[PDB]
Amino acid sequence: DSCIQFTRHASDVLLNLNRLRSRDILTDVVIVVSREQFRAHKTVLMACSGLFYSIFTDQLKCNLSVINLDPEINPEGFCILLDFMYTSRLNLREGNIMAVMATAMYLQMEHVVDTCRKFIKAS
Amino acid sequence: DSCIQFTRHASDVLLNLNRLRSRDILTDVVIVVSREQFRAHKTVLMACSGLFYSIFTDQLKCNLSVINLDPEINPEGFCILLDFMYTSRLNLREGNIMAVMATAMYLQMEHVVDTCRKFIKAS
């Protein structure tokens, strides 16, 4: 086409979606990870994760307001990944990299799994 | 912080949100523009437009499944702007620039208004 493009548009959209999350505006699901609860937007979860994409395209699960993750999933690893979904920023540290990689493999977040594998290979 | 960043994350999120829109997945509102109807995600509309941000943060309007725009709003101008919201791409042409600028001013999409003003000033 003959379209023009605004370079910062996608980043600005994601920044506003994170502002909505932080104020708990139009969040439509709570993700339960052991004792911890995380409010989010189903569409953002689907856009970032192969697992949530499969869950919320399912004709029955699409209507659930509560999703319980596998008890092996670490709440901190999930929190770091949820922050990444809404910001593009990953808080990857020596003390959390194993939990982050395991959570990203379960959530099917291919690019996060790839950087975790590379950072582990380096050490 | 000590975060790493995935450059393409925001663009990939927006691309997936547009894929959900195209398949009518988890759309939660219909925007009525004269006779024309447009399905969308309230969160994406809010993230892109000062007008939708004001509408869906209102305690009563946040629950509406149908929003009717002012009858002066042109459906084609709206369609071009809705496509921009989900892609960062603006189909700006000599034949639509006046309708696009008027719709962007009404929707409070400051960056679109700015490029329309510049393209009009050039001609």
Binding site: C3, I4, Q5, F6, T7 | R89, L90, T115
Partner: peptide, 4 residues
Amino acid sequence: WVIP
């Protein structure tokens, strides 16, 4: 704005 750019030419994509």
